[PDB]
Write a protein that binds this ligand. Structure first.
Ligand SMILES: [Ca+2]
Length: 357
C-alpha cells in the first residue's frame, strides 16, 4: 500500500459534515498536559486552508502554561494537531486550550476547570491523552469519572481518543486493557480507522491497524466500568481476558487515524503528517460544535442518544482487528457495534437530521 494524507476539510467532506455551520457562538476546550502551540504555524495553516483563523486562548491550570518545545516531533505535535483539526472544521467556535502538569491531579483539575469555566463556558471538551485504565490510581479514575458525569449533567460534550496501541493498549502482562479516560462511560470514546475517501464517497474504511511499529486504535471491554444501560443492545462482547466479564465497550464512534492516511498539519513551522486517535476527538469535537450551533443548544452528553439512533446515521466498519500483539485477532470488527470502531464513523448530516426537533 501507499501512504496518503488528507487535510482536515477533506475528511470532514468524507463524513458528510453539515455544511453552512462553523461553530460560531460555540466554544471548544482542548486538554493539553505538555508542550505548547506557536501562532506562526496556526495562522499559516488556517490561511493554507482558506479558512478564517479561529480565536485561540490558553488557560493556565495548576501552574502550567503554553510551553512549546520547538520539536514538531514532540508534544507540540499533539497540541497543534488538536487545535488545527478542530479549528479548521469549526473555525467559527472559540478554542480554549487548557495546559496542566502531567500528573493525575493536573489532568483532573484541567477537566473540572474547563468544564465549569465561567469565562470561556465551553460546551464541548476534547481529550487526546490518557492511559491504560488499570494503570491509573483508582482514586484518580473515580475522581475523573465523576468529573465527566458532572460534565454531562451540565450540557457539555466530552470526547477522548481511545489509544494508539490496539487491544493490549501497550502493556505486556499478556492481558487486554482499554484506555482511560476513554473507558469512562460518560465519555464519547473515539477510536481510529484507515479511511479511503474522496470528495463524493468513502471508497473503503477499515479498522486502523499498522502492527506493533505503526500503531493501532485502542478498544475492548472495560474491566472497571459496568455495562451501560444504553450500551446493552450494542452486543458488546465480554472481555477476552481469562475470567471474562461484562464491561462498557470501547470505543463509541471511530474516525480516520491511520498515519499512513494521516492528517496534513503544520507543527512548529514544519509541514508534516500526523495520525492516531488524538486526531479523532477534535475531529468530532468540531462536529458537535456545528450541531450545537444549528440547534442553538448543547447536545451535551450524546452517548445514550447515539446508541439508539437508526442505522443510516452511521457508516459501519466491519473489516479489521486492533490486535498488534498476537495472532488471536482480539479485538476484531464486524457488522454493527464492535470493540474496534464502536458504532462506526458518523455521517454528520444524517446525524444533525437525527437530532433536530
Ligand atoms: Ca461495525
Amino acid at each position: 500500500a501507499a501512504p496518503t494524507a488528507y487535510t482536515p476539510l477533506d475528511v470532514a467532506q468524507a463524513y458528510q459534515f453539515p455544511e453552512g455551520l462553523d461553530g460560531q457562538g460555540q466554544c471548544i476546550a482542548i486538554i493539553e498536559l505538555g508542550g505548547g502551540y506557536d501562532e506562526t504555524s496556526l495562522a499559516q495553516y488556517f490561511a493554507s486552508l482558506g479558512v478564517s483563523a479561529p480565536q485561540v486562548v490558553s488557560v493556565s491550570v495548576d501552574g502550567a502554561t503554553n510551553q512549546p518545545t520547538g520539536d514538531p516531533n514532540g508534544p507540540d505535535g499533539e497540541v497543534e494537531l488538536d487545535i488545527e483539526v478542530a479549528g479548521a472544521l469549526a473555525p467559527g467556535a472559540k478554542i480554549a486550550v487548557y495546559f496542566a502538569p502531567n500528573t493525575d491531579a493536573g489532568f483532573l483539575n484541567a477537566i473540572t476547570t474547563a468544564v465549569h469555566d465561567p469565562t470561556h463556558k465551553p460546551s464541548i471538551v476534547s481529550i487526546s491523552w490518557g492511559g491504560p485504565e488499570d494503570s491509573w490510581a483508582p482514586a484518580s479514575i473515580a475522581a475523573m469519572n465523576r468529573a465527566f458525569l458532572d460534565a454531562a449533567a451540565l450540557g457539555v460534550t466530552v470526547l477522548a481518543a481511545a489509544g494508539d496501541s490496539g487491544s493490549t493498549d501497550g502493556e505486556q502482562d499478556g492481558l487486554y486493557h482499554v484506555d482511560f479516560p476513554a473507558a469512562s462511560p460518560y465519555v464519547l470514546a473515539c477510536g481510529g480507522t484507515r479511511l479511503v475517501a474522496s470528495a463524493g464517497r468513502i471508497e473503503r474504511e477499515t479498522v486502523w491497524n499498522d502492527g506493533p511499529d505503526g500503531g493501532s486504535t485502542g478498544g475492548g471491554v472495560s474491566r472497571i466500568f459496568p455495562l451501560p444501560s444504553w450500551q446493552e443492545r450494542a452486543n458488546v462482547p465480554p472481555s477476552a481476558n481469562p475470567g471474562a466479564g461484562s464491561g462498557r465497550g470501547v470505543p463509541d464512534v471511530a474516525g480516520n487515524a491511520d498515519p499512513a492516511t494521516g492528517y496534513e498539519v503544520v507543527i512548529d513551522g514544519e509541514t508534516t503528517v500526523i495520525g492516531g486517535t488524538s486526531a479523532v476527538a477534535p475531529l468530532f469535537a468540531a462536529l458537535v460544535a456545528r450541531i450545537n450551533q444549528k440547534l442553538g443548544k448543547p447536545v451535551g452528553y450524546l452517548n445514550p442518544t447515539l446508541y439508539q439512533l437508526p442505522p443510516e446515521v452511521f457508516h459501519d466498519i466491519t473489516e479489521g482487528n486492533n490486535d498488534i500483539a498476537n495472532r488471536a485477532r482480539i479485538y476484531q470488527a464486524g457488522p454493527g457495534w464492535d470493540p474496534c470502531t464502536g458504532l462506526g464513523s458518523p455521517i454528520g448530516i444524517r446525524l444533525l437530521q437525527a437530532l433536530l426537533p
